[PDB]
Amino acid sequence: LKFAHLHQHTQFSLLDGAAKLQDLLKWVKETTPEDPALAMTDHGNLFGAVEFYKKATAMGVKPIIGYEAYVAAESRFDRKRGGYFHLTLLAKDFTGYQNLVRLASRAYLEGFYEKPRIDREILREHAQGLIALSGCLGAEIPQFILQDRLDLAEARLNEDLSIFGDRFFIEIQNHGLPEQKKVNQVLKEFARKYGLGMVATNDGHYVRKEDARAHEVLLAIQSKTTLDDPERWRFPCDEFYVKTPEEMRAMLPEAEWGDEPFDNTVEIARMCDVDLPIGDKMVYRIPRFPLGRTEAQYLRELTFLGLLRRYPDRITEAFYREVLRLLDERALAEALARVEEKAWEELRKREWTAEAILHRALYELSVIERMGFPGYFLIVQDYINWARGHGVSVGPGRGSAAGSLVAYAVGITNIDPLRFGLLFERFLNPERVSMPDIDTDFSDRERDRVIQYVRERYGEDKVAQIGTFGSLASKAALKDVARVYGIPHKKAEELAKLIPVQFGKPKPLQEAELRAEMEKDERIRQVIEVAMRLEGLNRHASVHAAGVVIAAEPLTDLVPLMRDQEGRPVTQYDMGAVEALGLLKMDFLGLRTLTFLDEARRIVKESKGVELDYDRLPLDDPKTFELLSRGETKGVFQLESGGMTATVRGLKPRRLEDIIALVSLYRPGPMEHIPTYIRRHHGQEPVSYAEFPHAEKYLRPILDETYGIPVYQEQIMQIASQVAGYSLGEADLLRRAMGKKRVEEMQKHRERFVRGAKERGVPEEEANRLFDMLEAFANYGFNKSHAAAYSLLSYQTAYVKAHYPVEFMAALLSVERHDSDKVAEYIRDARALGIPVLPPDVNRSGFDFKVVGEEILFGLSAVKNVGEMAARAILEERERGGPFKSLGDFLKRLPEQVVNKRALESLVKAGALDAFGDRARLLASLEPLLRWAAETRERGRSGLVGLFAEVEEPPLVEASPLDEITMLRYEKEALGIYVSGHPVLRYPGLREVASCTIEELSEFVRELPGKPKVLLSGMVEEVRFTLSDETGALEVVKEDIPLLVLAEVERVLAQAVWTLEEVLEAPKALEVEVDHALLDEKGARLKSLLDEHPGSLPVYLRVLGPFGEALFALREVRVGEEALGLLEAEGYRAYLVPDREVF
């Protein structure tokens, strides 16, 4: 006797599934050795399939691919507020697999209501190659039976029979459920009546019986409730696990069920021969390109016609002509394209010269053609060179890609791969076949449009973004479980901080060494197990930012789909899984820095009429480096880090290759090689090669550009390529194989190394230690291809900040104008940078942030109630009739029809109409001026020329000025942020008692004790109230009332709060403000001046230190109030501040 499950859910039935793929697949194997099988039947997705099939296939288990599908009462198109039912589906042959992919695809695109649902209409369309099973208790035929509508169930059994035929079975499962008794007792009659045959299953959602609660909390996490709610999601019993053949016949006896429902499980799984193109198979689905030209010929053509642009001074019209005479401008490329590979190699045999370029070019192409990747390069180049002409910034490139010359010739890459040390052989190793990945950056604003270009260009059915499935984290796992177990949040987090952090993410709970915390509480015992019993599970399905696919055949025909909340065609198979099926995949990353370069250039073009042609700037521009050297990185890509900034200020880099090497070495590990870089760079330490005297004549060239440090991997490859006699290709393999650290496969390369090293120079003693030097540096060394690429951007950024520093800031502000916080911030940076930032101005403002003269001026768009039409409207009516002359002249040119009263209100509140006088006066005048305006046209449309038709706007109505607090209040209501001040500046008391500003909080606090308490004072902005200084914003746990807050910190949690008038009531103290320039003979100058008027007020000292500022609260002495009057009577600034103590 034996058995094999055909209904088993997995980690991939995301909401309710708790069976991890691995320990499930062994549990099935360890149960039955003989021809074991498992069907993967996830709830309405195919997420598992691939990554499952391949795990079981190399484990020793035959897999079967399946789908517990949601079938709608009626049409998948319905949206009824009947339901949706279950249905067990298995794919028997490969066509079946396709039709499964299709269904789950369609269930998502065409029929998504709550769950993704298929019609019986489409099921019938796609039945070819499928076996169905009557279904779990919630499926159709059983359900109807439960309802005493036998007459419908049999009718629906007939229907289903008309669809699959002798490939539909009656599903019999049993748990201790009375509903199952009645359903089967009839299902049993059916299978005998129509002549159907029964298959025994039992719907595993967990692996082994002990996974009961472990699972029954996974629910409590998907339901987000306590273990004791109730009403919390629960299953009906603890019986949904991968049972033994023996535990089965316990739910299905012998004299009641017979051998048929077992010997059918085995026999089905056998007839289910399904194979996924993978490994042994996997054909490259490189999509075709449209063009009397070879796929490869064109790419060749485009390259030539490219170099000529790329290298003006050294590849010419005349040059190509010379080549062809050894055998228009476009007309030469068209021809050089048609030289064959037997014909080419009759020239080489008869500093980067004109030839040198040809060779490398022709070589690259030779390796491209031979490999089968010319098409690829086209597809890629095409969409990129489109984005250029269509206002979509494209980054210089990323990763290995950069180093191919063809890549750079055809505008895929955009950095001269041979002016830097970039390598083709790192991007495409000639001596092993592997899909080269070409990732590309894009202006993030515009990225999707490129995807759309591809989408429309290659087919709406061939183009999708790739799926991503987050892992439950060991750290997080433990949290969520503890929520469930009725536990105080704190000790929860005291359990989280046990678990290590080995690299980026937390260590698995498998190895996790203060375990004695278990043996204390029996509550915690489970919590810890349960968390590791859940470790590997899944969250939900996000689109990958970068992932895109271009299939060659319709996607639906191999890879299933989804549409995400904002209508993206998404793949159900993950990154690897896709790439494992062998599909053309690519990253289309979004990149802020690019968008920022765009708005800068626009702002620059407007400011001073200068075309910023980023792909044509000198890379030796002094004033750029001198900035980075002064360490003014603030807005400059990549080197923005707290720490990294400091480094640069010491390195003082003079040429790009320094930014490149800085960037490359700055990360834990290599880091240390940085000081050396610096002392070598400042020119104070020789760069010596006495350790490999014979190898020097090979090293210097490679490592001199890097003050002697193997930083870049290419630098490594080259060393081997040159010293060992390695083909640059082979060289790569070396670096590759030293990465894999294959214990004893290394001593094979060692030999091949020395053996060649002799034949070139070094006498092995050097060789060995040199190889030692390689395996030493290679583990940390970097990809220059990538490094240099990005570096260029940092330069590009720095250059702007250096040469156009105002507009720079505007572009900053502009780009992130959608962050009330960042804007405030960017403002404050630019404010204390010599630049003023101005309110909008109906006269001077452009639409967006604008740079006028030397100031950053707002736009009208930024005004909160003003429509967008109305902003542009204002403008155009201000550019056909010139500059606005009065608020009258405004309201007659812009009727209420266009700018409503509300609009007007804010527009004044903003200060756009400041150009006219006092604000409060304006606001009240509006209404009676609109009564005037509207009346003017009534006169105007009644004949009457321009004197009888205008009683010209009587002067503005009158009212007392807007006091600051009330005035500032409006600005923000109107502009999201405050301009020209801040409430907290008006009543200083709160400043003077506060321990910090919001800015400094982070840096004052970290260094004190562990988890400190502190007092903070600013403005409130929430009903998790938000607190603001003139210096920042903090989440802390009504509107426009100032407070002082005593709160504990780690994000900051409040303990106590006081009202302004409670703070101006608590007794006062004296604070002398003192400069750092004080004498020995002053601290006892002050000391005596205080001694002479003692009392009961404490004394405080603000000592403005060179780097920071601290509050020395005197000592013994306590002054008696009268002191302030006699104290301001010397070069000392003073205040009667509230007394910091009390709080």
Ligand SMILES: [Cl-]
């Ligand atoms: Cl060295």
Ligand SMILES: [Cl-]
């Ligand atoms: Cl060294």
Ligand SMILES: [Mg+2]
């Ligand atoms: Mg059905």
Ligand SMILES: [Mg+2]
């Ligand atoms: Mg890629």
Ligand SMILES: [Zn+2]
């Ligand atoms: Zn379920």
Ligand SMILES: [Zn+2]
């Ligand atoms: Zn099920």
